[PDB]
Structure formats: C-alpha cells, structure tokens
C-alpha cells in the first residue's frame, strides 16, 4: 500500500501538539524518539554483485572486448538485441544465491538414497562456534553425514591436493565408507557383547513393528467383515 | 575417419580430398615410404 507518513512522524505531530498547547505534559517517549531518529527512506536499492557465486550484475562485454570469433565462426561487429534492450530490472531483482555444494549434495543423496533414512536435526546451535580442520572428516560436535563428504571435498579442492571435483569427491566417499564400516561393526559387536554378558531387551525393532502391524490388522479385519456383509447384501439385491 | 572412410555412403570430404590431391598425396607418401624406402 501507500508508503505511509504518520507512523514515522509521530514525533512532529506530538511536537505541534505541545507547542500549540493541546497537550500539557510531554510524553515519556518524546526525548527517546527525538534522540533516536527513525528510518524514513523507504526506497528501492540496486545491487551489483551476487554474493553467492560472485558474478557482477550490471556490466556488458562490448564488441571491443571480444575481438576473437564466436563458436559459430563469426566476428561480432554490432550489438545484438539482448544488449540493446535495457535491463534495470536485474539490479533491483534479488539475486538467486547459488552454491557448487548443492550439486554435490544432490549427487550424493541420489547415489545413496538410504542415507536419507538417517535422521537429521535441522535446529541450529551456535553456528559461529565451529572450528573444523577438514583434513579429517571426523569432527567434534557434528554427526557423520553427507555434509562431511561435501566439506572434505571442498577442502581438498581449496588446498589443491586434487584436480577436478570428481577426484576429491571419490576420495571423500571412500573415506566415508570406511568410517561407516567401523561404526556399524562397533554397533553389532557391542550388542553381541551385551547379550553375551546377560543384558536383556524388552522389545526389539522387528517385534515392535509386528505389534504395530497387529494393531492395524485388527481394525482392517473388522472393516473387511463389515464391508463384505454390506456388499453381499447389495449383491443379493 | 574423414576422407579415409571405407563406408558405402561416404561424405563430401572424399570429393574435397580428391580436388585437393590430399588422398593422392598421402597415398604416394606412404607408398614411397613402403616400397622404395623398404619401410
């Protein structure tokens, strides 16, 4: 709607009241608001560089700056329509933040779908209190997820121990496999130890699932008998 | 494989090689290395 005017100008209206004499006693917020001026621009603001990738928004590459030939074999000697048209809209449209990490994340999760089955907590906790040396994927204070593989890959790329990205990704995933192997073997061995030494478990996952299946199947049973009665009745008619 | 094509349905590169003497040039080059030079 309108860029309204009175909310930001409460101070001046009250000042007019006070000077004229409408209000006898000066409000308590008067001096505070006077000392802290409100923001009163309400203007659109152009942006020139996308902060995610780093691309520059608002620059051409004129004909002089492409003296070579195009992929089709022609030399560009005159501006094209795309150049000739104005593009002010780009400056004021919020940029589309993009990361090279997303491609790797999607690739990892469509190479290992069941890794999605390992729950992930999305509530942050002091994101500014992380000190990770990504020479090693194991880090204190975070789980062993695909993000570990991604960060290891970008550490390898940044410190230039590998060339293209697939090499670093392969190395990181082959470390990930070893760590997961260790973890699962530890789980199974600890369970077998406890059962060796007499630990007793009230419920296991399989029988918990069986219980839930029974509590569903009883209702299914009653529903099927009632409906088969109904359909036999209708068929008899 | 270009002008060296042996397929039934060759392309225009073969005719280009003929009009350029490229095929004949390469052929005499290799033959001269083979029979005269014994290589």
């Amino acid at each position: 709607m309108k860029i309204q005017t009175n909310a930001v100008n409460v101070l001046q209206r009250t000042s007019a009241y006070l000077k004229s004499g409408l209000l006898k006693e000066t409000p308590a917020w008067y001096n505070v608001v006077a000392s802290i001026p409100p923001s009163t621009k309400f203007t659109r603001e152009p942006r020139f560089k996308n902060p995610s990738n780093g691309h520059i928004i608002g620059k051409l590459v004129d004909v002089t700056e492409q003296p070579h030939a195009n992929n089709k074999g022609l030399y560009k000697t005159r501006p094209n329509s795309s150049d000739k048209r104005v593009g002010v809209k780009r400056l004021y449209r919020p940029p589309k933040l993009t990361y090279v990490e997303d491609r790797l994340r999607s690739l990892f999760y469509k190479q290992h779908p069941w890794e999605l089955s390992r729950p992930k907590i999305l509530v942050e906790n002091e994101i500014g209190d992380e000190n990770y040396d990504w020479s090693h994927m194991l880090q204190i204070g975070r789980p062993l997820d695909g993000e570990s593989v991604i960060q290891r890959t970008m550490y390898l790329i940044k410190t230039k121990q590998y060339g293209d990205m697939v090499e670093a990704y392969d190395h990181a995933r082959y470390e990930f496999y070893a760590l997961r192997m260790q973890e699962e073997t530890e789980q199974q061995v600890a369970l077998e130890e406890a059962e060796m030494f007499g630990s007793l478990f009230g419920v296991s996952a399989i029988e918990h699932g069986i219980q839930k299946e029974q509590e569903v199947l009883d209702v299914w049973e009653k529903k099927v008998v009632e409906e088969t009665e109904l359909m036999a009745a209708r068929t008899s008619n | 494989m270009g002008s060296l094509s042996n397929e039934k349905f060759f392309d225009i590169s073969l005719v280009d090689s003929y009009l350029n003497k490229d095929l004949k040039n390469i052929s005499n080059k290799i033959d001269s290395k083979l029979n005269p030079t014994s290589n």
């Binding site: 992930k120 204070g141 789980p143 062993l144 600890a190 369970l191 007499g198 419920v203 918990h208 | -």
Partner: protein, 257 residues
C-alpha cells in the same frame, strides 16, 4: 559436546595423584586420559541426535531398552560409573581455600553402620568389606565394576557388573557371564528376569527399578594395571575400599528428612 568435568584440586591430583591409592601417572591414565577418550567417543556417537542434549545418566536410561544403541548405552554407563568412582575416591570433596579441611579424616556414619547391620545379618563392616573383595575377585573374570547398592526394600546388597553394567537398571546389570558354564539356579534367575520383563505394559519394554548406588569401585585394568599390576586387583580393591570419601557415601545415603 560432552567435556570431562573439572575435578577439585586438579593440580594436586595431576602433580602427585590420589594418596595411598593411585600414583600420579595411574590417576592420569584413569581419569585425564580414559575419561577424555570416553567423552569424545560419546560425543562422536551421539552428535546430531536428540541424545546430545542429555547427560550420560539419562542417556543410558533412555537407551537401555533399545538393543542396537548398545554403543551409546555402554559409553554413557562407563562415563557415569567412572565419575562416580573418582568422586568417591576424591581426597577432598571441596577445595581447602583458606580452611584446614584436611585436619580431619572422613568416617562412615552411624546410619550407614546400622544399614550394614540389618543388611548383612548384623555383620561387621570389615566382614562385609572382605566378602566384597572376595566376590569381586571371584565373579568379574575380566573388566567390570563393583557396587554396593540400595534397593526399594531399604536394604543394601552387593552387585557385580561385567564390562559396563548399570546398577540402576536391572536387566542391564550385566551381572552374569554366560561365556562359561552356568548353573541351574542362575538360569532360573535369568528366566524370572525375562518373565518380569514380559510383564511390562509399555511398548518401550521397560520395567521399573530403583536400585541406587551407594559405593562404586572400578575394576577396569585402566585403573590398576599401571601401579598394582597383573593379578593384584585384589590388593587394589582392598586399598580403595579402605580409603574412601565417606562424606560422599553418606550424602548418597538417604536421610529421610
């Protein structure tokens, strides 16, 4: 993050170790090394999971039922039991500061003595101590823990745990070793334990219990091997039994007021 708690007089324990029980190096190994190892293991195990927000005791209580969560259960139990042990063997519970707290040695309370009297057919505390060491050396074939615990019947009794057991929760006491031969009475005890488990009326498969620990002693070789050596765990247990923090023990005891 699970970080090792700060023990009082840490400079003293690091410089010379706990007197009459463990050397400086041995106490370093048992606490400043093993506890750090255990806590980092637990942090890496439970990172990114709901259990990261709970103390080790609550972690073991929650994870007791779940079979597959045996690593986190064992880690939490070991952390809690180790801290219990070190706390009861601390020389000074509270830092001396400007007060001469060391002038007087701790002793058991008359309430504790009466509890022993009723619990063990009116036997002497020293008799109970010798029976405790005998049981510890005869039952725990390898690593484990020794506990004097109190049940809901207001009577103390002795509990031996293999590897990493918990006095609190009875199906995970790990009291019996099934690797070797077993007896008819023990098999019946396991059977009745199983039946009591089956009586549970919740999907979590949990059974109520209130067996609380009054005294805890670690039998892991990480504590005794360096100083006492192989086969001397009996002497090590004897020594720790005679030297204890009876202020802590009495505080663990339930007063009722």
């Amino acid at each position: 993050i699970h970080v090792v708690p700060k023990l009082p007089n840490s400079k003293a324990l690091l410089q010379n170790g706990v007197p009459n029980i463990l050397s400086s190096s041995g106490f370093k190994t048992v606490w400043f090394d093993y506890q750090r190892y255990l806590c980092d293991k637990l942090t890496l195990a439970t990172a990114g999971q709901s259990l990261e927000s709970y103390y080790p005791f609550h972690i073991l209580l929650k994870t007791a039922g779940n079979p597959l969560q045996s690593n986190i259960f064992n880690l939490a139990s070991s952390i809690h039991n180790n801290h219990l042990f070190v706390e009861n063997i601390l020389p000074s519970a509270v830092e001396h500061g400007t007060n001469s707290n060391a002038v007087v040695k701790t002793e058991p309370s008359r309430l504790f003595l009466s509890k022993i009297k009723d619990s063990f057919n009116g036997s002497d505390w020293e008799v109970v101590k010798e029976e405790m060491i005998y049981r510890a050396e005869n039952e725990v074939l390898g690593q484990g823990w020794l506990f004097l615990v109190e049940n809901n019947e207001k009577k103390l009794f002795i509990l031996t745990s293999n590897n990493n057991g918990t006095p609190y929760y009875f199906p995970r006491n790990q009291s019996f070793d099934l690797n070797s031969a077993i007896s008819i009475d023990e098999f019946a005890t396991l059977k009745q334990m199983k039946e009591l488990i089956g009586k549970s009326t919740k999907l979590n498969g949990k059974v109520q219990d209130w067996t609380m620990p009054i005294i805890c002693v670690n039998l892991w070789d990480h504590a005794y091997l360096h100083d006492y050596g192989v086969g001397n765990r009996s002497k090590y247990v004897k020594n720790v039994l005679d030297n204890l923090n009876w202020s802590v023990v009495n505080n663990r005891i339930f007063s009722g007021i």
